[PDB]
Structures are given as C-alpha cells and as structure tokens.
Amino acid sequence: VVPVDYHLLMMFTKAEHNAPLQAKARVALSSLLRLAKFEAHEVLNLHFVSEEASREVAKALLRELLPPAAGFKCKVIFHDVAVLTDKLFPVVEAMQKYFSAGSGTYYSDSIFFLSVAMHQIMPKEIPRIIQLDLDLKYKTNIRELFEEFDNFLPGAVIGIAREMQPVYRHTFWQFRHENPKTRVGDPPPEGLPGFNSGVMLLNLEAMRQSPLYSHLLEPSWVQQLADKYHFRGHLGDQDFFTMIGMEHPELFHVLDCTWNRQLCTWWRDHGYSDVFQAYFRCEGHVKIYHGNCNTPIPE
Amino acid sequence: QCESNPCLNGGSCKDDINSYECWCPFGFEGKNCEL
Ligand SMILES: O=c1ccn([C@@H]2O[C@H](COP(=O)(O)OP(=O)(O)O)[C@@H](O)[C@H]2O)c(=O)[nH]1
Ligand SMILES: *[C@@H]1O[C@H](CO)[C@@H](O)[C@H](O[C@H]2OC[C@@H](O)[C@H](O)[C@H]2O)[C@H]1O
Ligand SMILES: [Mn+2]
Numbered sequence: 001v002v003p004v005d006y007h008l009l010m011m012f013t014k015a016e017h018n019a020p021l022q023a024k025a026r027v028a029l030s031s032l033l034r035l036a037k038f039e040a041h042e043v044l045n046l047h048f049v050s051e052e053a054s055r056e057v058a059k060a061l062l063r064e065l066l067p068p069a070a071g072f073k074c075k076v077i078f079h080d081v082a083v084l085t086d087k088l089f090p091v092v093e094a095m096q097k098y099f100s101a102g103s104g105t106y107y108s109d110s111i112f113f114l115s116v117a118m119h120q121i122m123p124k125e126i127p128r129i130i131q132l133d134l135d136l137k138y139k140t141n142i143r144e145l146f147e148e149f150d151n152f153l154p155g156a157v158i159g160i161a162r163e164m165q166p167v168y169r170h171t172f173w174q175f176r177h178e179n180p181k182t183r184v185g186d187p188p189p190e191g192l193p194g195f196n197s198g199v200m201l202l203n204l205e206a207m208r209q210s211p212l213y214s215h216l217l218e219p220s221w222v223q224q225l226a227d228k229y230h231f232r233g234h235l236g237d238q239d240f241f242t243m244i245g246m247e248h249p250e251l252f253h254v255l256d257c258t259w260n261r262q263l264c265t266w267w268r269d270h271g272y273s274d275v276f277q278a279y280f281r282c283e284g285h286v287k288i289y290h291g292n293c294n295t296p297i298p299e
Numbered sequence: 300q301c302e303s304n305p306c307l308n309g310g311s312c313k314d315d316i317n318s319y320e321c322w323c324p325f326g327f328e329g330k331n332c333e334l
Contacts, residue, residue: 101311102301102312102315103310173308174307174308232309232310233311234311234312270324271326273326
C-alpha cells in the first residue's frame with residue numbers, strides 16, 4: 001500500500017506557565033484524537049509551530065494522548081517559530097502594518113501571517129494542510145474535513161468559514177459609509193461578513209499555482225486594496241484573507257458554519273446588539289466548536 | 300494582542316496614539332464607548 005498522508009498544523013507558542021492555553025490544547029487534541037479514524041495505510045501528521053519551551057510542553061501533552069484509541073498511524077512534527085518567522089518576513093512584511101496590533105512592522109507579529117505564505121513555507125511534497133486553532137473542540141472525525149478539498153471550484157485556493165460576529169461590519173465602516181449599497185461587512189446569506197481563521201483548508205498546490213493569489217501577496221497590491229477598503233486590523237491572516245475575499249471571492253471555498261462554530265459574543269456588547277444575531281446564527285449538526293475570545297465551550 | 304478599538308475611526312487597537320477623536324457605534328458614549 002502506498003501510504004497516504006494527512007497534514008494538520010497548529011500554532012502552539014508561549015505555552016510554558018500558561019495554563020489556560022495548555023488546557024485549551026488539551027481539550028482540542030483529546031477530542032481530535034479520540035474521534036479521528038483513518039484507514040490502515042493512512043498517516044495523520046500533526047505539525048506544531050512552537051519555540052523550544054512550548055515544544056516540550058506539547059510533547060508531554062502528546063505522550064499522554066498517543067497512540068490514539070483508533071490505533072491509526074500518527075506522526076508529530078515541530079517547526080521552529082523563529083525559523084518560520086524569518087522565512088515569512090520578506091513575503092509578509094508589507095501587509096503587517098495593516099493587519100497587526102497595531103503599528104508598525106515587528107518580527108513578533110509575522111507568525112500571525114503564516115497561513116498566507118504557507119505554500120512557500122511547507123516542503124513541496126505537502127500538497128494540502130489544515131491549519132487549526134487550539135481553542136477548538138472536535139465533534140466528528142477530522143478525516144471528514146479533508147473531503148471539502150474536493151468541493152473547491154476552479155480558482156479557489158483556500159477553504160474557510162465566515163466570521164460569526166459583526167467585527168468586519170465595524171472594521172469596514174468607512175468603506176460601508178462611502179458605499180451605502182455594499183455587501184462588504186453585511187451578514188449572510190447575501191452579505192460578505194468576512195472570515196474566521198480558526199479552521200483553514202490550505203491547498204498549497206492551488207496557492208502556488210494561482211497567478212491571482214501570487215499577485216495579491218505583492219506589496220503594491222496589498223497596499224492598493226487596504227487603501228481602497230480603508231482597512232486596518234490586528235487579526236493577521238484572518239484580516240488579509242477577509243480583505244482579498246471582498247475583492248476576490250472566487251479564491252475561497254466557504255465552509256459551512258458547523259465546521260467552525262465560533263462562540264465569542266464580545267462584539268454583541270460593543271455596539272451591535274441589533275444585528276448580532278444575523279451574524280452569529282448557525283444551525284445544523286456541529287462538527288467543530290471554536291471557543292474564541294476565551295469563551296468556555298459547552299459540554 | 301491588543302484590545303479592539305471600540306471607536307469607528309482610527310487604528311484597530313484602542314488608544315491608537317495617532318487618534319484624537321472617537322466615533323462610537325450607535326447607542327454608546329464616552330472616550331471608549333462605555334455607556
Ligand atoms: O499565546 C498564544 C496565543 C495563541 N496561540 C495560538 O493561536 C491561536 C489563535 O489564538 P486564540 O485562539 O486565542 O485567538 P481567537 O481564536 O480568540 O482569535 C490559538 O488557538 C493558539 O493555537 C498560541 O499558540 N499561543
Ligand atoms: C476585539 O477585541 C476584543 C477584546 O480584546 C476581542 O475579543 C475581539 O476578537 C474576538 O472577536 C472577533 C473574532 O474574530 C476573534 O476571534 C475574537 O477573539 C476583537 O475583535
Ligand atoms: Mn481561536
């Protein structure tokens with residue numbers, strides 16, 4: 001049997017003496033592994049981006065959870081946050097001033113853009129990868145998410161779920177003001193509410209092979225679009241994808257909300273009580289919960 | 300990370316050094332859109 005690889009990537013940094021992060025990672029990784037099922041020839045590759053202290057914390061957590069109940073093959077890989085930061089920076093520098101907390105351009109923010117240049121960072125042998133937050137709880141076999149790659153329409157490079165709060169309604173205020181009739185920042189099903197980065201299907205091949213996507217990474221394109229949209233953010237990759245998602249929705253396969261059911265309600269209590277429901281509504285059988293903004297996940 | 304700017308104008312982080320005005324979403328008032 002020719003072995004078939006599946007690749008996941010999670011950020012796991014500054015985890016030493018950070019108990020809330022470790023407990024989050026524990027909830028994510030146990031549900032993931034408890035519920036995952038893979039055929040005998042298949043291998044689940046778990047990529048962690050970590051400085052050396054967090055690598056050790058991750059190893060201690062992983063040993064307690066591996067091998068997985070289901071008995072499938074699993075490989076753990078660590079990538080140095082510092083090595084990735086230096087590889088990312090040339091590509092990512094120019095977008096940092098628009099999407100980082102706050103300004104200007106710091107190395108410490110570069111890693112929050114890893115997904116945007118993932119196709120240039122991972123070895124070419126990896127054709128696809130799913131990048132996942134650690135404040136998640138899995139309610140299904142992660143293997144099922146991979147089939148959504150098959151639903152990418154021509155030109156689509158990334159699979160991503162919508163943002164479930166009106167944060168982008170707020171961020172795009174001036175563009176909305178100047179364009180009363182825009183769908184930019186509006187709720188679904190017909191509005192463009194932007195994206196959440198907690199669950200992302202990164203088709204590295206399609207990213208590498210897309211002329212449009214490559215252009216959008218260029219400093220002058222980043223700058224032209226940020227100017228056009230009067231866009232400032234501090235959520236990194238999420239903000240960049242949201243923005244180029246306004247201009248070029250063909251790039252994105254929108255995942256159903258049940259693949260990244262966000263629980264954060266912070267924006268409800270900060271000016272958006274009326275419209276909040278229209279953003280936050282998600283129905284159907286939930287596959288992944290996302291306890292964003294430190295929101296306890298139900299049990 | 301930074302706390303989101305509750306204001307509609309200026310940078311994405313609250314207490315943007317380069318901002319002097321704060322325009323609050325409807326129904327809120329104050330230097331940080333409190334009440
Ligand atoms: O100190 C940190 C903060 C964040 N993260 C990772 O970055 C993701 C994004 O942060 P978080 O989920 O807290 O942000 P939110 O989902 O609220 O935007 C987390 O899930 C973690 O994987 C990390 O490794 N160390
Ligand atoms: C504004 O700042 C607040 C408080 O620091 C954050 O909680 C907000 O982020 C949350 O809502 C938007 C989601 O995309 C984030 O994942 C979530 O943490 C931030 O917009
Ligand atoms: Mn998260």
